[PDB]
Amino acid sequence: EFVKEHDWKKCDQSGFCRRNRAYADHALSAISWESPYKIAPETGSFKDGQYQAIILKTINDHGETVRLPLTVSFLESGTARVTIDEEKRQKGEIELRHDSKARKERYNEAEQWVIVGGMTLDKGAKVDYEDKTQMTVKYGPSSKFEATIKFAPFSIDFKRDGASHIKFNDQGLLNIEHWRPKIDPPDDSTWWEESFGGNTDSKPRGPESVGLDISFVGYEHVFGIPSHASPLSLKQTRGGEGNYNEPYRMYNADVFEYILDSPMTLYGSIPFMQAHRKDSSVGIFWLNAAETWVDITKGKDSKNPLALGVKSKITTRTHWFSESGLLDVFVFLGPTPKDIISKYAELTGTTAMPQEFSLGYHQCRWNYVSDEDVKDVDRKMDKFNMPYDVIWLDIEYTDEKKYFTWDKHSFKDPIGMGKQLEAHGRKLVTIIDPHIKNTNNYPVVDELKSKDLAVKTKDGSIFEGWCWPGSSHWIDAFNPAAREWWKGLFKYDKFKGTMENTFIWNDMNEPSVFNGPEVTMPKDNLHHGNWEHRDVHNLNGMTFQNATYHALLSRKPGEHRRPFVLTRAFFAGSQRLGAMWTGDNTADWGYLKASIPMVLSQGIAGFPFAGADVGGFFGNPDKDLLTRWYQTGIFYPFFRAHAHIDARRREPYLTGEPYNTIIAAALRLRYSLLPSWYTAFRHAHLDGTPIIKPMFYTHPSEEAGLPIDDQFFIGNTGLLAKPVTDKDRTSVDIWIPDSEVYYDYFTYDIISAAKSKTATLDAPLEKIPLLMRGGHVFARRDIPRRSSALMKWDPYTLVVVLGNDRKAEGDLYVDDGDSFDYEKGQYIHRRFIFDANTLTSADYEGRDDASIKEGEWLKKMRTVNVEKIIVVGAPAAWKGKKTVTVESEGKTWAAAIEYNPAEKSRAAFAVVKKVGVRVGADFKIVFG
Numbered sequence: 001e002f003v004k005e006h007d008w009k010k011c012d013q014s015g016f017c018r019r020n021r022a023y024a025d026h027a028l029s030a031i032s033w034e035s036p037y038k039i040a041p042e043t044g045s046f047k048d049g050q051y052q053a054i055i056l057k058t059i060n061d062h063g064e065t066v067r068l069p070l071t072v073s074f075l076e077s078g079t080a081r082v083t084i085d086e087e088k089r090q091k092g093e094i095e096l097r098h099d100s101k102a103r104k105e106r107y108n109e110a111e112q113w114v115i116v117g118g119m120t121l122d123k124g125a126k127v128d129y130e131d132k133t134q135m136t137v138k139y140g141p142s143s144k145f146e147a148t149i150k151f152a153p154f155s156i157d158f159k160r161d162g163a164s165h166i167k168f169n170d171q172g173l174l175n176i177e178h179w180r181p182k183i184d185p186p187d188d189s190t191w192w193e194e195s196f197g198g199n200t201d202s203k204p205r206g207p208e209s210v211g212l213d214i215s216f217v218g219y220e221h222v223f224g225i226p227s228h229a230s231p232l233s234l235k236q237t238r239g240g241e242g243n244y245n246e247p248y249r250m251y252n253a254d255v256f257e258y259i260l261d262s263p264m265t266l267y268g269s270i271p272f273m274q275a276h277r278k279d280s281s282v283g284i285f286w287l288n289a290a291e292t293w294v295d296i297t298k299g300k301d302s303k304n305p306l307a308l309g310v311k312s313k314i315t316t317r318t319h320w321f322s323e324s325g326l327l328d329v330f331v332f333l334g335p336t337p338k339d340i341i342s343k344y345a346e347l348t349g350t351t352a353m354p355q356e357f358s359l360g361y362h363q364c365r366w367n368y369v370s371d372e373d374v375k376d377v378d379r380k381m382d383k384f385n386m387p388y389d390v391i392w393l394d395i396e397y398t399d400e401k402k403y404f405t406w407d408k409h410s411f412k413d414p415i416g417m418g419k420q421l422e423a424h425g426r427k428l429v430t431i432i433d434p435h436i437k438n439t440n441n442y443p444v445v446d447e448l449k450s451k452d453l454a455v456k457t458k459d460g461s462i463f464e465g466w467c468w469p470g471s472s473h474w475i476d477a478f479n480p481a482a483r484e485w486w487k488g489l490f491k492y493d494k495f496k497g498t499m500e501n502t503f504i505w506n507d508m509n510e511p512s513v514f515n516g517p518e519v520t521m522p523k524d525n526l527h528h529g530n531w532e533h534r535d536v537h538n539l540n541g542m543t544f545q546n547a548t549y550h551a552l553l554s555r556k557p558g559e560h561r562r563p564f565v566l567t568r569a570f571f572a573g574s575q576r577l578g579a580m581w582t583g584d585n586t587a588d589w590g591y592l593k594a595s596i597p598m599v600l601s602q603g604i605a606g607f608p609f610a611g612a613d614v615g616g617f618f619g620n621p622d623k624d625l626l627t628r629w630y631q632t633g634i635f636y637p638f639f640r641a642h643a644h645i646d647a648r649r650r651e652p653y654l655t656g657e658p659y660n661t662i663i664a665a666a667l668r669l670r671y672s673l674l675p676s677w678y679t680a681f682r683h684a685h686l687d688g689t690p691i692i693k694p695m696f697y698t699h700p701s702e703e704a705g706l707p708i709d710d711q712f713f714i715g716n717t718g719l720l721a722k723p724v725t726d727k728d729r730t731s732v733d734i735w736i737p738d739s740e741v742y743y744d745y746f747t748y749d750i751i752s753a754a755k756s757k758t759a760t761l762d763a764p765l766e767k768i769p770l771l772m773r774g775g776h777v778f779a780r781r782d783i784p785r786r787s788s789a790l791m792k793w794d795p796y797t798l799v800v801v802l803g804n805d806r807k808a809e810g811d812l813y814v815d816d817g818d819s820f821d822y823e824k825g826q827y828i829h830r831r832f833i834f835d836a837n838t839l840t841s842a843d844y845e846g847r848d849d850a851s852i853k854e855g856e857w858l859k860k861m862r863t864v865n866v867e868k869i870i871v872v873g874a875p876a877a878w879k880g881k882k883t884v885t886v887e888s889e890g891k892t893w894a895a896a897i898e899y900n901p902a903e904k905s906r907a908a909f910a911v912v913k914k915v916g917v918r919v920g921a922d923f924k925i926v927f928g
């Protein structure tokens with residue numbers, strides 16, 4: 001690898017970060033500090049759910065002002081939006097330095113990239129009160145939400161249920177760096193050119209950062225702003241025991257050997273933060289694509305947060321600042337975590353419906369070295385009864401790092417390789433990165449250049465820099481023409497050697513530039529639209545994944561199907577485009593433990609299709625670590641093993657016994673649960689529901705769960721997992737969230753009942769700690785197969801998990817896994833309800849059976865049954881009854897049931913075999 005010893009800006013080395021931190025330091029120590037920003041009330045108007053006014057910023061002691069247009073929107077969802085722009089820049093009345101052609105306006109296209117819905121203004125929103133000092137707007141459901149806008153100094157307080165929850169500018173940290181010329185006196189050391197990492201940023205606009213304090217009143221825990229190697233409940237950043245000293249950073253970057261427990265940026269950024277306490281949740285989304293830092297402190301509400309004489313109630317103070325663009329913030333008032341995330345997903349998108357196969361196990365390393373290597377691994381997995389769906393090719397498959405080629409010495413017959421995988425319904429994934437080799441006899445680069453599709457430098461020249469191919473240029477995927485060109489390259493008849501089972505991995509899309517500052521592009525590079533790279537950096541990865549997503553919709557005439565694209569770099573909205581992973585982690589126990597809070601943070605930030613490299617990327621995991629890593633990785637929504645080029649081969653059949661058997665058992669569990677995993681992805685698609693769910697989300701009334709980040713619920717199943725992530729551990733302490741009954745998934749032992757507590761569970765190497773909560777039904781497929789495709793027509797088992805209510809609910813969603821026919825109703829979605837000794841299956845959306853004409857997939861599913869029902873926590877009244885009564889599609893019959901009484905701590909349970917009811921039809925089964 002090119003960079004041996006990396007240089008990352010600390011906050012003091014980022015000019016605008018230094019300035020905003022210093023602004024805070026001044027404001028928070030000034031006596032009677034007043035923010036020098038005022039609404040000019042006579043400029044204000046409220047109409048049809050929107051307030052518009054001019055904020056005047058006082059810029060010097062002579063009282064000179066600049067005009068900053070304010071827009072506050074009250075949306076039908078109950079979300080509010082606050083936007084501040086700069087009028088002189090809107091009017092183009094500034095002069096860029098260096099004869100730069102960069103845009104004069106503040107970047108205002110983040111919305112175009114990110115926002116897909118939820119923007120309808122609430123015409124029911126109304127001014128409840130105003131005078132010459134303030135105005136209050138009521139909005140939200142039944143007018144329950146209020147925003148009080150104070151004019152002088154400017155502030156906004158967002159209220160519900162008789163209190164303030166979120167305050168803007170309470171601490172007076174609002175900072176919009178207005179345009180100024182470079183003039184000498186008649187601290188500006190960071191205003192103009194800045195050098196770092198072997199590069200000087202020409203900085204043609206000068207200072208232009210935007211920042212604000214956002215206070216979460218009475219909240220002690222905040223969450224989100226992935227991606228960081230950090231706890232789910234974010235740390236403070238201004239010092240203290242256990243805390244950081246630097247703000248959280250979002251500046252998508254290629255961070256070689258990234259460390260644990262750090263606010264340093266990683267590869268992707270979602271500037272979305274929630275605050276949660278018992279029975280109250282709120283949140284903000286900072287819609288800004290530039291380099292962004294977030295400071296976090298917690299204490300009392302007093303100016304000295306450690307003062308005596310004041311109420312103890314904690315407020316979390318957050319200080320957001322971005323290098324350029326608009327101040328543009330959405331405010332969510334909940335009141336539950338589910339509400340907040342659903343509203344966020346309405347704005348930025350829900351999870352795309354995945355390729356079904358992509359929930360399977362993915363086998364990868366850097367590299368499989370030939371087509372024969374690939375075919376041998378495929379055979380070996382089958383010899384060792386280790387199911388898997390996809391094999392991956394990293395960068396060594398290419399001809400000298402030219403994308404859209406194959407190394408013909410080593411990959412002689414890629415179609416034959418593709419066809420072998422197809423015999424088990426398996427897939428191939430091939431890497432394609434955004435750097436295009438600058439060399440002769442390569443039509444891809446010729447077209448990139450002649451069509452003007454490459455990112456440019458500060459002066460309009462084509463950008464050149466180094467990555468895997470050596471000297472390279474970069475696709476500018478902000479350009480719609482570049483995205484349309486890119487589509488053409490993926491057609492099966494153009495990208496030779498690919499076929500219908502070939503999908504794509506996008507990497508190095510931060511962009512990673514080996515000889516660039518912080519391994520990325522200069523900030524004064526120019527993109528399509530004449531935006532500076534500084535304006536759009538955090539969107540770059542997403543634009544590239546977008547290009548590839550749309551290339552995979554159709555690669556031959558008549559084809560229309562779901563993409564699968566893995567990305568490294570990402571932004572808000574990337575959930576619409578495919579999966580991510582957490583990049584170059586390390587083969588050590590601390591990274592295994594860290595993976596779970598990271599993957600959880602992804603899902604609560606609205607991008608749940610996430611995972612970490614199983615085994616760790618860098619290094620050689622011990623056999624026990626690798627084994628535990630499989631047991632955790634089967635709970636990542638995106639489940640792939642991967643290894644760095646210097647790591648030994650560690651395909652799972654190489655581990656040896658007893659590890660092989662334990663790893664195979666983990667794989668078999670993932671596969672058996674695939675019906676429930678796919679259903680969980682369906683809910684993520686319907687309304688942004690996370691796929692794996694932290695305690696704050698499932699149990700908003702249970703304060704003790706707030707920071708817990710090492711256990712989680714799966715989908716809609718009530719399954720509670722706590723993988724072992726510590727070396728040589730042979731037990732685990734699980735926090736039981738509530739008073740329901742919890743059962744061991746494998747033995748049906750009663751682990752807890754009647755009261756929230758910590759329960760200690762045996763957990764040797766061969767144990768996956770997995771509990772079933774009472775009140776839930778979930779589906780699985782018990783028959784083991786070699787791949788998910790080979791399970792498509794197999795019968796289902798339903799597990800009905802009862803607590804003392806003897807009542808439960810769950811669901812199952814199935815479709816063809818590939819097309820967009822789901823949009824026209826071609827799917828099965830069952831709601832299963834157990835109540836009063838009866839299990840029923842109904843269509844989840846209450847559709848009439850002959851409101852939909854059955855396509856080919858639905859017709860084939862007529863042969864697919866629910867065949868087995870297990871009831872855990874079976875009532876004693878059922879003892880000695882040998883049948884249940886089954887009714888379906890007009891027919892009634894008896895099915896045999898076996899009742900097993902409680903024994904020691906093992907629950908009573910009953911099993912119905914050979915139920916024989918088609919999964920697509922209503923049924924009613926009466927027990928007892």
Ligand SMILES: OC[C@H]1NC[C@H](O)[C@@H](O)[C@@H]1O
Nearest residue numbers: 366394395507568583584
């Ligand atoms: O392609 C080489 C290398 N690039 C960086 C990626 O994070 C890693 O997964 C990959 O193996």
